[PDB]
Amino acid sequence: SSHKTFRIKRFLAKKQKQNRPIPQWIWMKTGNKIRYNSKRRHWRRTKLGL
Amino acid sequence: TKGTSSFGKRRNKTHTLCRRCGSKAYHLQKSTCGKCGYPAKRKRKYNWSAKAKRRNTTGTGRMRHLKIVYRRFRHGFREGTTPKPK
Amino acid sequence: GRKRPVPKGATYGKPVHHGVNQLKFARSLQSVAEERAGRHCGALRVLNSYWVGEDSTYKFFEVILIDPFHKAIRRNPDTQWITKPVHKHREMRGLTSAGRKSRGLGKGHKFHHTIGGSRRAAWRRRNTLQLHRYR
Amino acid sequence: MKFNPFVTSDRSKNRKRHFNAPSHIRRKIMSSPLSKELRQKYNVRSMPIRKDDEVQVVRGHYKGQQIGKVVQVYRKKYVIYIERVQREKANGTTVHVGIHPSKVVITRLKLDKDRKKILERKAKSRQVGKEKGK
Amino acid sequence: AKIKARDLRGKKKEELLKQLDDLKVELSQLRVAKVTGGAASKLSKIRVVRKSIARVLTVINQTQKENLRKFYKGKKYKPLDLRPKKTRAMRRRLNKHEESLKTKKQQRKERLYPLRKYAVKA
Amino acid sequence: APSRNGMILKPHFHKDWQRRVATWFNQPARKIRRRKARQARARRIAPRPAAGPIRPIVRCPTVRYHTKVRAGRGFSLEELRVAGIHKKVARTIGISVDPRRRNKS
Amino acid sequence: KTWRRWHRRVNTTQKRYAICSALAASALPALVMSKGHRIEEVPELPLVVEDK
RNA sequence: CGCGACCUCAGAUCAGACGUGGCGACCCGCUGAAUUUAAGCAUAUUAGUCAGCGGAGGAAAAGAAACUAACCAGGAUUCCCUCAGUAACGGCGAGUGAACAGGGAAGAGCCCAGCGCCGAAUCCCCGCCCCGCGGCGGGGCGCGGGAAAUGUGGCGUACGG
RNA sequence: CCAUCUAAGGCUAAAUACCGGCACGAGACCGAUAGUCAACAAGUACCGUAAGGGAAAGUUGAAAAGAACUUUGAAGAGAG
RNA sequence: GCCCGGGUGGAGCCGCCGCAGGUGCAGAUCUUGGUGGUAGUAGCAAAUAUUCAAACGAGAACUUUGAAGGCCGAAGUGGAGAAGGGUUCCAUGUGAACAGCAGUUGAACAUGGGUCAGUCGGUCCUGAGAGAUGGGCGAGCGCCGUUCCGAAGGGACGGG
RNA sequence: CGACUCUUAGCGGUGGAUCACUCGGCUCGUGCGUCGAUGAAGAACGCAGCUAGCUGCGAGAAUUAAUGUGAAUUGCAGGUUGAUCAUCGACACUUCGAACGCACUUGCGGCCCCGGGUUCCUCCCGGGGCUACGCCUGUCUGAGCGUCGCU
Ligand SMILES: [Mg+2]
Ligand SMILES: [Mg+2]
Ligand SMILES: [Mg+2]
Ligand SMILES: [Mg+2]
Ligand SMILES: [Mg+2]
Ligand SMILES: [Mg+2]
Ligand SMILES: [Mg+2]
Ligand SMILES: [Mg+2]
Ligand SMILES: [Mg+2]
Ligand SMILES: [Mg+2]
Ligand SMILES: [Mg+2]
Ligand SMILES: [Mg+2]
Ligand SMILES: [Mg+2]
Ligand SMILES: [Mg+2]
Ligand SMILES: [Mg+2]
Ligand SMILES: [Mg+2]
Ligand SMILES: [Mg+2]
Ligand SMILES: [Mg+2]
Ligand SMILES: [Mg+2]
Ligand SMILES: [Mg+2]
Ligand SMILES: [Mg+2]
Ligand SMILES: [Mg+2]
Ligand SMILES: [Mg+2]
Ligand SMILES: [Mg+2]
Ligand SMILES: [Mg+2]
Ligand SMILES: [Mg+2]
Ligand SMILES: [Mg+2]
Ligand SMILES: [Mg+2]
Ligand SMILES: [Mg+2]
Ligand SMILES: [Mg+2]
Ligand SMILES: [Mg+2]
Ligand SMILES: [Mg+2]
Ligand SMILES: [Mg+2]
Ligand SMILES: [Mg+2]
Ligand SMILES: [Mg+2]
Ligand SMILES: [Mg+2]
Ligand SMILES: [Mg+2]
Ligand SMILES: [Mg+2]
Ligand SMILES: [Mg+2]
Ligand SMILES: [Mg+2]
Ligand SMILES: [Mg+2]
Ligand SMILES: [Mg+2]
Ligand SMILES: [Mg+2]
Ligand SMILES: [Mg+2]
Ligand SMILES: [Zn+2]
C-alpha cells in the first residue's frame, strides 16, 4: 500500500536490509561452519507476516 | 463457496504489532493485545502453558541491567571507590 | 454472604456443587475491609481495625495504618519492626488480628488442622512419602 | 592425586576451558621449555613463547639442529610459525607450517624488562621452594 | 598521533571542547572520503577518530561529575545522580544509626544482667 | 480382584503422590552441615559448655513412663528462689529457666 | 525415577563376619597367590613391620 | 455585618518522601473443578488437588498456652523417628484418617493498652556554628515552627507490680 | 466438687523448605531416531488472524598441504 | 551362536569370577528415514493463430527488429487508483537452481540505483460507538457506568 | 548362439546404517540467595574498513575510563610513555515498556530559562528544565445558616 505508517516503513526497511547474502570472506575464516545465508526471504514465497 | 472462493475476500487485517510485547497480536477493534494484554498494567501470563511462559521469561532478552547487577553483587555492591592507581 | 459468581445457575458438575446463594466467605468482613484499605493505600502498613457501626446493608470499620518511612516511627526502636520489608501487606497475607482468625490458628486439640505453619503446611507434611535412603 | 574440591578433573570441562580460554590464558598455555644452557643459567624450566625467540624443533617432520627465529604466534590456532619451517603449495608460493610450542625449545630469549622480571620471579619462587624442601 | 586520556585530565573545558570539535570535523572528512573512495589508510583511521572522540567525551563527563559531587558533598539534599546507587531494596533499609539504637528499657536490662563468661568443671 | 487367599489391603496411593515425594539423598550432607554448625558454635562460645544450659529433673507425665526421669525444659521460679538464684541472673550464668512449671511435690 | 532403591542395609553382625572372613583368608598363601598377588619372595605373608 | 479561634472538608507543577511492574523453584491468604474409583451412579473419592486471583522473603509461616494431661505430672514454635494405617470418619461400601505421650535436631525470650506516679518530663521539621559524612548522624545556639492533654516519654504486664 | 489456663493487642533468630537465579563439584546415566524441543546462526526457520504450534541439521585431513600447470568442451563436466 | 583365513578400515577392545539393567523383533492400517514395481506410463487438450527474413549467440518453434495474417473491440486482453503486497520498480550482468518443453528471456539469481509537497492526503471535527476520573460493586486481577450519589471554570474586557 | 528374465560373486552407483569419537544433555549434591519511578523484566531500531546471521554494544554504539597482565588481533587490509586479553569500583546508557504533559498518528500542547531574528518588542527557529496517578508529614490559599467568642 502506498499509504503506510512510519513504523511500518521502518520495519520494512530493516527486513529489506536483512536480505543480503553473506560476505565471501566469511566462509574461509578458521572457526566457521556457515556455508550460506539460510534466512533469505523471497516476497513470493513467505509473506512477512504483518 | 465456503472455501476457496471465500478465501479471496480477506483483505483487511484484525491484528497489528503490539507496542509493548512486539508481537502481531494487537486487536484493533478491541484495542487490546492478545499475547500480553497491553492496555492492562499487568502482563498476560497463565501457567497452563509453560511453553508460553518460557518463551518470553526473564532469561530470554538482553538482560542489560540484571546481567550487570549479577556481577556487582559479587563485591557487596561496592560503590564510590576506585582501585589504587599506578 | 457470598453468592457463587456463575452465569445463571450453571455450576456444571455433580449435584454436591450446585449451591449458589447460601454459601459463606471464608474471611470476615473486617478482614475484607482491612484488605481494601491496604490495597487503596499501598504506601502504608495496616496495623489493626475495629468496628464502629453497622446497619442492614453496611458494616463500618476504622482501620489504623502506619506510614513506614516517617522518621517519627523509624527512629523509635519498639515500633520499627513494621518498617521491615517482611511486613508488607499483612492484611493481604492474613497476618493482622482480624485476618488471623479465619486461618484456624491455635494451640490444643481444637486446632489440629494447622499443626505447622497453616493448613497448607499440615496437608503437605501429611501427604508426602518419606522415601528414606535405606527403607 | 588431586584433592582440591574446587578444581575439576572432568574431561569435557577441561577441554571446554582449554578450547575457549582467553588470549591471556593462551599465552600461559603455549609455553615451551628452555634449552639446557638457559635452564642452568636462569634456574627456570619453561617460559611462554614470544614473537622473536629462536627455536630448535624436537618432534615432527621438521626436527633438526637448525636455529629458527619465530615470525609470529597464532594464539587462535594454538600455533607458532618459525621462519625456516615451511612448505610450498601447488602454485609455488611458500607458506609456514604450524608447530605447537610444546614440541619446541628456546635457544635464547628476547630479554625485555618484563621478560627478565618474569625470569627473576620464577627463579626466586623455585629457589625458595627448594630451600623449604631442605 | 595517539590521543590518550592520561594527559587530557589537567586541561580545562574550553580546549577540551575545541579538540572535540577538531576531532568531529576530522571524522566528518573521513566519512565523506570513505564515500567518495579513499585509501585503506584513511578508512582505518575512522575507528581511531571515533575512539578519540569517546575518550575526550569520557574525560569531560568524568571531570564534570567529579566537580559536581565535590561541590554537593557539603549539602543535605543531593541530585539523584549523585545519590548512592545500590539496589532499590537496600536503598530503603534502616540506616546504621536507626538500626543500632536501642530503647532505654533494653539498655537498662542489658546493663543490669550482661552475659557472663564461665565454664563448669567435669 | 482378590486372588485365592490373602490380606485385604488399603494402599493410600489414590492421590497424586508422585508429585509430593521426599527423597533423602541429602541426608549425609545434612549431617555434615549440622556437625559443622555444631563445632562452629562450640568454638564461638569458648569456655562455655557445648551442650548448653543445665536443665532440671522431671518425671514423664504418663502411666506408661512415670517411672522414668527426663531432662526438663528449665528450672522453675520456686526452685530458683529457694536455691537463692535470681530469675534474671540464672539465664546469664547458665541455668535454663521457665516460669510455666509448677511444683506439686 | 530418582526414588529407586539405590542403597541397601546389611546386618552389623554380617558385616563383622565378612570382615573376619576376609582377614582370616588374607593369611593363607594359596588364596593370596590365587588372587594374583606376586608374593613368592615374601618371607611371611602375615607381614608385620615395626612402628618405625 | 465584621473580626478571631476550633471543627470538618477542599485546592495545588507547594517542601520532602513512599506504592505501582517483573520473576515466581520454595512460602502465605482466597477461590476452586471434572476426568478417575466405586466394575452402573447421585453421598463419598479424585481433592481442598489442577486451573484462576492476590502478597512476600532469603527463607516464609508459626511461636512463648484462654496447652497437654489425669500421671509420683509435663511446659513456646518448627523439623525427623515412632505412635499408626491406629482412635475415628465412611451408600460403615469403595475408601479416607489424625493427635498425646516417648527419643532426637535446634533451643531465646519478650513488649504494649489498661491500672497509677512524674511541672509533656515526649516527638518531627527549619536557620547558624563544629566533626566525619558513597547506609545524612552527633554536640551546641535559635522570645524558630509544628505535633501532642480526644494523651508523647520514663517506671511497669500476670513469671505479679 | 476437682484439674488446668487467662481469649478477644504486638515482636522474636535456629533446627525446616527450594524443578526459578548466580557460581561450582560429581555420576555403575544418554551417546546425535538417544539425552532437554534445542551438542549446529533453536524457541531459529516455518504454519496459523490470533491464542498457540515448532523442526531438520555433528565428524576431510596431523597439518589446507583444499589439486599449480597441459589438454577437449560454451559450460557443467573429464583425461593427464 | 561362535572360532579362524582373505579384503576394507584407522584407535581402541576382549576372555574368566561376580554386580546392575532403558538387554534380543516380522508383524502392532507400529514411529522416523531410505528405496522399488507401477513407469519412461497417466499426463503437459477451457478461452480461433500463427508465418517469412535478418541479428546476436556454442546453441533459436519460444529472444530482438522488420514484414504479413489474427484476437481483445471502449461493461477491453486499454489507461489510472483503494485494500493487500514490500522492492516485485529501473539499468547492467549470469545462465548453476526456479519459471512442470526450451530460452540468448524473466516478477529467477548477482551488482548497483530509485519515492523531493504550505496548496495531494494523514494530521483537525464528530457519527455509529469506544473509553478514564467522581461514584458504585467487587475475595481479587478488576468490573459497571459516561453525567449519572461530584467544591468538575486555572479563563477574561475592564478597574484598583 | 542373440535379446529378456533369474541366481551367485567382483567392481561401480544409490543410501546413510553400524562402529569409534563429544566444547551437549539428564540426575544428585554444595555455597550464595541479588530486580524496579536513581526507571526493571520484555520489545523495537540502530552501531564493524570490508558484516548477512549468532554474539556484544547504545549516537562515547563488536565499546570509553581505571586496575591487573605483558606483545598481540587475524579472514584480508591499515597503523613497552603499554598491543591484546581479563577484571570491573569511574563515566555513559536511543524509542517503547509499571511508562509519567495529553494521545498513540509520532500528532498536539503549556510553563520557566538560554542561544539565533530581535539587538526584548513581540512572533519564528534551535537548545535545556519541568508538566502522570495514589498516598504520608509539613506549608500556603480557602470553604461551611458546623460549634462558638468580642462588636
Ligand atoms: Mg500469494
Ligand atoms: Mg501476575
Ligand atoms: Mg474455602
Ligand atoms: Mg471467633
Ligand atoms: Mg593446590
Ligand atoms: Mg487370576
Ligand atoms: Mg497369593
Ligand atoms: Mg469401568
Ligand atoms: Mg459413567
Ligand atoms: Mg462427589
Ligand atoms: Mg473434599
Ligand atoms: Mg495453582
Ligand atoms: Mg507485586
Ligand atoms: Mg528480594
Ligand atoms: Mg516471620
Ligand atoms: Mg503469657
Ligand atoms: Mg507440643
Ligand atoms: Mg504396628
Ligand atoms: Mg452397605
Ligand atoms: Mg480428605
Ligand atoms: Mg510429642
Ligand atoms: Mg539436644
Ligand atoms: Mg501511658
Ligand atoms: Mg492476654
Ligand atoms: Mg498472644
Ligand atoms: Mg508474627
Ligand atoms: Mg565426591
Ligand atoms: Mg550415527
Ligand atoms: Mg557422516
Ligand atoms: Mg582419528
Ligand atoms: Mg543404560
Ligand atoms: Mg523391522
Ligand atoms: Mg504418453
Ligand atoms: Mg488496467
Ligand atoms: Mg500501468
Ligand atoms: Mg522488470
Ligand atoms: Mg523448464
Ligand atoms: Mg512549488
Ligand atoms: Mg469502562
Ligand atoms: Mg551386482
Ligand atoms: Mg549490522
Ligand atoms: Mg580501555
Ligand atoms: Mg592496559
Ligand atoms: Mg488518529
Ligand atoms: Zn502485546
Swiss-Prot record, chain B:
InterPro entries: Ribosomal_eL37, Ribosomal_eL37/eL43, Ribosomal_eL37_CS, Ribosomal_zn-bd. PROSITE patterns: RIBOSOMAL_L37E (PS01077). The modification N6-acetyllysine is found at K9. GO terms for molecular function: MDM2/MDM4 family protein binding; rRNA binding; structural constituent of ribosome; ubiquitin ligase inhibitor activity; zinc ion binding. GO terms for cellular component: cytosolic large ribosomal subunit; synapse. Zn(2+) binds at C18, C21, C33, C36. Pfam families: Ribosomal_L37e. A zinc finger (C4-type) spans 18-36. One of its GO terms (biological process) is positive regulation of signal transduction by p53 class mediator. Keywords: Acetylation, Cytoplasm, Metal-binding, Phosphoprotein, Ribonucleoprotein, Ribosomal protein, RNA-binding, rRNA-binding, Zinc, Zinc-finger. Component of the large ribosomal subunit. Belongs to the eukaryotic ribosomal protein eL37 family. HAMAP family: Ribosomal_eL37 (MF_00547). Component of the large ribosomal subunit. The ribosome is a large ribonucleoprotein complex responsible for the synthesis of proteins in the cell. This is Large ribosomal subunit protein eL37. It comes from Oryctolagus cuniculus. The gene is RPL37.
UniProtKB/Swiss-Prot annotation, chain C:
Keywords: Cytoplasm, Isopeptide bond, Lipoprotein, Myristate, Phosphoprotein, Ribonucleoprotein, Ribosomal protein, Ubl conjugation. Residues 96-117 are annotated as: Disordered. One of its GO terms (biological process) is cytoplasmic translation. It is found in: Cytoplasm. Component of the large ribosomal subunit. Interacts with IFIT1 (via TPR repeats 1-4). Belongs to the eukaryotic ribosomal protein eL15 family. Component of the large ribosomal subunit. The ribosome is a large ribonucleoprotein complex responsible for the synthesis of proteins in the cell. This is Large ribosomal subunit protein eL15. The chain holds residues 70 to 204 of 204 of the full protein.
Swiss-Prot record, chain E:
GO terms for biological process: maturation of LSU-rRNA from tricistronic rRNA transcript (SSU-rRNA, 5.8S rRNA, LSU-rRNA); translation. CDD domains: Ribosomal_L29_HIP (cd00427). The keyword rRNA processing does not apply. InterPro entries: Ribosomal_uL29, Ribosomal_uL29_CS, Ribosomal_uL29_euk, Ribosomal_uL29_sf. Its main location: cytoplasm. Component of the large ribosomal subunit. The ribosome is a large ribonucleoprotein complex responsible for the synthesis of proteins in the cell. Component of the large ribosomal subunit. Belongs to the universal ribosomal protein uL29 family. PANTHER family: 60S RIBOSOMAL PROTEIN L35, LARGE RIBOSOMAL SUBUNIT PROTEIN UL29-RELATED. This is Large ribosomal subunit protein uL29. It comes from Oryctolagus cuniculus.
From Swiss-Prot, chain F:
It comes from the Eukaryota. It is found in: Cytoplasm. The modification N6-acetyllysine is found at K15. The modification Phosphoserine is found at S76, S105. Signal peptide: none annotated. Belongs to the eukaryotic ribosomal protein eL13 family. Component of the 60S large ribosomal subunit (LSU). Component of the ribosome, a large ribonucleoprotein complex responsible for the synthesis of proteins in the cell. The small ribosomal subunit (SSU) binds messenger RNAs (mRNAs) and translates the encoded message by selecting cognate aminoacyl-transfer RNA (tRNA) molecules. The large subunit (LSU) contains the ribosomal catalytic site termed the peptidyl transferase center (PTC), which catalyzes the formation of peptide bonds, thereby polymerizing the amino acids delivered by tRNAs into a polypeptide chain. This is Large ribosomal subunit protein eL13. It comes from Oryctolagus cuniculus (Rabbit). The gene is RPL13. The chain holds residues 2 to 106 of 211 of the full protein.
